[PDB]
């Protein structure tokens, strides 16, 4: 049995930690909703 619990408000936070790169990738999406890399 699945249940939900509140975790917070949805807001933009000034001076949040900034990380992560921005890759441009060719991908395919199959009938099962799974992505795969196209090469």
């Amino acid at each position: 049995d699945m249940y939900i619990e509140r975790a917070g408000d949805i807001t933009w936070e000034k001076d949040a930690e900034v990380t992560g790169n921005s890759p441009r990738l060719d991908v395919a999406l199959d009938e099962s909703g799974d992505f795969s890399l196209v090469e």
Partner: protein, 156 residues
């Protein structure tokens, strides 16, 4: 149950202890999550029941109590924030500049941030606090890093 707008954890007591299987967004009385988090099953909020209303395995999205309400879109230029809600940990904002998933049907923003699978369904936001999609449907790239699409539904 609780119907206040905001971000929620999706939990199960079927496995050992209480396990976080995902996250979701409550907005305008509709609960929004990724299909793979619930597999379309009913949810509980206290003593209240949330029944699935719309879903699609290919988009990997599902709404409860009403139709999909989130329609904001990434502008294709600006940094966004993932409001990550990891299992057993406090909600935390992470700012990033999305990359792009290029597909035969068009381009989609993507966020190169790696969190445990039970973080799936966490919202990605723009600078006005609008939900531009949900985190958790993605791929593993060449160097072994995980990258998630910014998955958004359609408001009918």
């Amino acid at each position: 149950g609780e119907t206040t707008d905001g971000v929620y954890r999706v939990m199960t007591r079927r496995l050992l202890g209480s396990t976080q299987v995902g996250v979701g967004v409550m907005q305008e009385g509709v609960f929004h999550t990724m299909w793979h988090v619930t597999k379309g099953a009913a949810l509980r909020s206290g003593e209240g029941r949330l029944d699935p209303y719309w879903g699609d395995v290919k988009q990997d999205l599902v709404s409860y109590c009403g139709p999909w309400k989130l329609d904001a879109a990434w502008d294709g230029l600006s940094e966004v924030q993932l409001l990550a809600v990891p299992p057993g940990e406090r909600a935390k904002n992470i700012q990033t500049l999305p990359g792009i998933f290029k597909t035969k049907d068009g381009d989609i923003g993507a966020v190169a941030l790696d969190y445990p699978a039970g973080t799936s369904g966490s919202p990605i936001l723009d600078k006005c606090g609008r939900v531009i999609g949900l985190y958790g449907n993605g791929v593993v790239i060449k160097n072994g890093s995980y990258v998630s699409a910014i998955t958004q539904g359609k408001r009918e």
